[PDB]
Curated annotation (Swiss-Prot), chain B:
Native source species: Naja pallida (Red spitting cobra)
Protein name: Cytotoxin 1
S-S bonds: 3-21, 14-38, 42-53, 54-59
General remark: Positive charges of Lys residues are necessary for cytolytic activity of this toxin, but not for its binding ability.
Gene Ontology MF term list: toxin activity
Length: 101, 60
């Protein structure tokens, strides 16, 4: 890799490329009793990917509540393993840019 | 610091400890705010959510 800012831009490109390759993308935001659920459904060929991020609303602001969930009718174990690793790597890249600034 | 609220056209004079404005959107829809107001620390963006933070009046 290059600089922390360049490594973050590459991860942004990989994330965007995932949603561009999807045939359709449907989003849903649900909230109830300080619990917020962010669901994105990707249509990829005949199958589907369901991405679920859950957050707890503390002091009116969203706070991360667990890692992202990847659910599929086939077996997104490997895809979910890459997506869950991509999420954690995407978070460290932002951390390193923020520590620099 | 005054930050725009999720319901326009209202703003909020931030209390002590919240020196940032933030807007929360889905990664594909930057023009549809999900959360919007004062905050202390900028949340890190995720695979589905993008956070934009700023520190001037009504910037979010």
């Amino acid at each position: 890799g290059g600089t922390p800012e360049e490594r973050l831009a590459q991860l942004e490109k990989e994330i965007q490329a995932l949603y561009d390759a999807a045939d359709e993308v449907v989003d849903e935001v649900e909230e109830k009793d300080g619990k917020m659920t962010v669901t994105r459904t990707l249509t990829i060929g005949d199958g589907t990917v369901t991405l679920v991020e859950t957050l707890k609303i503390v002091d009116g602001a969203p706070v991360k509540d667990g890692e992202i969930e990847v659910i599929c009718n086939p077996e997104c174990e490997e895809l979910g393993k890459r997506l869950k690793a991509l999420a954690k790597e995407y978070e460290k890249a932002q951390e390193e840019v923020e520590k620099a600034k | 610091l005054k930050c725009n609220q999720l319901i326009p056209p209202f703003w909020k004079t931030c209390p002590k400890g919240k020196n940032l404005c933030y807007k929360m959107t889905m990664r594909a829809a930057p023009m549809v705010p999900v959360k919007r107001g004062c905050i202390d620390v900028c949340p890190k963006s995720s695979l589905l959510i993008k956070y934009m933070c700023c520190n001037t009046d009504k910037c979010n």
